[PDB]
Amino acid sequence: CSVDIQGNDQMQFNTNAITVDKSCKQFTVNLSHPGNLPKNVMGHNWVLSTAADMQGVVTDGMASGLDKDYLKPDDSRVIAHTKLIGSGEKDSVTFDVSKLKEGEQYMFFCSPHQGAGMKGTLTLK
């Protein structure tokens, strides 16, 4: 009921498809950042939304800037997210699986680097 995900200095996650077992009450994402760049240069987060909401979350988040960890304050389209991290840092987020609809289309992504392709899928199986 948890996953360890890495974001690197090349704006890649080390996975692009998360499966959430239906037996899980909660799900945990453990985000880390290999490499050698600070958070104000090459910062990463982990953000969950529906596929439909992703573009708008990313656009509004980018425009909110670093100080706001590239997320629009109190964004209702964000199901779950970590904080923004630099190299050698880590952060975890846990959410209620009850917030997911089984078999539906969810995307995960880093908000400042989604446009560079830092994204993948998540499915309640």
| Binding residue (CB under 5 A) for Cu ion from 33, 44, 81, 119 | 44
Q: Annotation-wise, does 44 bind a ligand?
A: yes
Amino acid in the structure at residue 102 = E
Question: Taking a C-beta distance cutoff of 8 angstroms, is the pair 121, 106 a contact?
Answer: yes
Strands of the chain (E only): list them.
2-6, 17-20, 26-32, 47-50, 80-81, 90-96, 106-109, 119-124
* Residue placing its CB nearer to Cu ion in the complex, 67 or 103: 67
H or E element at residue 91: strand 90-96
In angstroms, give the least distance from the CB of 16 to Cu ion: 14
Does residue 110 interact with Cu ion by CB under 5 A? yes
* Residue placing its CB nearer to Cu ion in the complex, 44 or 72: 44
* Residue placing its CB nearer to Cu ion in the complex, 72 or 113: 113
| Binding residue (CB under 5 A) for Cu ion from 33, 81, 113, 119 | 113
Percentages (nearest 5) of helix, strand, coil residues in the chain: 20, 35, 45
Q: Which stretch binds Cu ion (CB under 5 A): 15-23, 43-51, 53-61, 75-83?
A: 43-51
Question: Taking a C-beta distance cutoff of 8 angstroms, is the pair 55, 22 a contact?
Answer: no
As annotated, the binding site for Cu cation includes 44
Binding site for Cu ion (CB under 5 A): 44, 110, 113, 118
As annotated, the binding site includes 44
